[PDB]
Design a protein around this ligand. Structure first.
Ligand SMILES: Nc1ncnc2c1ncn2[C@@H]1O[C@H](COP(=O)(O)OP(=O)(O)OC[C@H]2O[C@@H](O)[C@H](O)[C@@H]2O)[C@@H](O)[C@H]1O
Ligand SMILES: [Cl-]
Length: 152
């Protein structure tokens, strides 16, 4: 039927198939969640740098790294919440990106996934608006467990 869950803790130790990373489109993961993802998942990071180098990372597209069929998590979903790191996030970026998140979850038969507060740290977006978008987008999903890490 589906299940969406608000939790506290550290996203990167979520017991899930797919992890959502918050990225920009300019090829650096210099702070926040993205810095932790660079440290925790170096291979994902190199692949992101390469994808940025092409022109392949843009707003409204998740950049997926497959860590292998025996990897847990198996997927890093690099979610663009910024264009340049110098500028804030925008609600639109989160709306467009959620739409692509839903597609790829289905396409990849992703059964469980965890996210942070998209755009609400270095992006400056109000959490309550971000949450709603996340709820409307993702509780819809059938046979997918969703873990959402609320801030404080
Ligand atoms: N380990 C963690 N687990 C769960 N939540 C976390 C963790 N670390 C941080 N957070 C929460 O996630 C929020 C979002 O982190 P940001 O990195 O600020 O994400 P965002 O606001 O989308 O900014 C994107 C920009 O910052 C970099 O991450 C990225 O390279 C991009 O340029 C933070 O404000 C914080 O509340
Ligand atoms: Cl950054």
């Amino acid at each position: 039927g589906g299940m969406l869950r608000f939790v506290r803790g550290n996203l990167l130790e979520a017991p899930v198939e797919a992890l959502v990373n918050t990225v920009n489109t300019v090829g650096v993961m210099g702070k926040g969640v993205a810095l932790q993802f660079k440290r925790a998942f170096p291979d994902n990071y190199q692949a992101y740098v390469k994808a940025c180098e092409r022109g392949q990372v843009q707003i409204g597209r998740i950049f997926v790294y497959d860590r292998g069929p025996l990897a847990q998590p198996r997927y890093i979903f690099n979610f663009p919440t910024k264009k340049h790191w110098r500028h804030p996030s925008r609600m639109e970026y989160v709306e467009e990106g959620l739409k692509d998140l839903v597609c790829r979850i289905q396409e990849l038969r992703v059964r469980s996934i965890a996210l942070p507060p998209l755009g609400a740290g270095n992006g400056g977006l109000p959490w309550p608006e971000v949450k709603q978008r996340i709820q409307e987008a993702l509780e819809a999903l059938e046979g997918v467990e969703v873990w959402v890490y609320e801030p404080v």
